[PDB]
């Protein structure tokens, strides 16, 4: 469960924020246009998505 009391939880909460904010700008590009749909960039999106799940699990969400 999520906690917000101590510095140990603060670090995990901070990591989640910048883990999700890296994913945020890619999904919009995935749908708004056909400019940046090369197979080489979907790979970066996939790695960011994979890191997001690990951040969630570490934070205990």
């Amino acid at each position: 469960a999520i906690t917000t009391g101590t510095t140990e939880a603060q670090a995990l909460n901070m990591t989640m924020r910048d883990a999700v904010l890296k994913v945020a700008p890619g999904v919009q590009q995935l749908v708004q246009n056909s400019s940046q749909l090369t197979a080489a960039e979907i790979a970066i999106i996939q790695t960011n998505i994979t890191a997001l799940k690990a951040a969630f699990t570490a934070a205990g969400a």
Binding site: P25, Q32, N33
Partner: protein
């Protein structure tokens, strides 16, 4: 900044009625567009003073 935004919107439809009838309403929907700049392109050349003086 390093990015810009543009808006998007849908359209409407036409209808008709006879006396005594009410009027219907419709819902419009929205979205957006974003662009970003990341890379710089350049050219450069160099010369020596001794060759420049001659």
């Amino acid at each position: 900044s390093n990015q810009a935004r543009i808006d998007r919107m849908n359209t409407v439809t036409i209808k008709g009625r006879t006396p005594g009838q009410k009027l219907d309403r419709e819902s419009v929907k929205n979205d957006k567009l974003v662009i970003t700049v990341d890379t710089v392109t350049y050219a450069s050349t160099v010369m020596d003073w001794q060759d420049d003086w001659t």
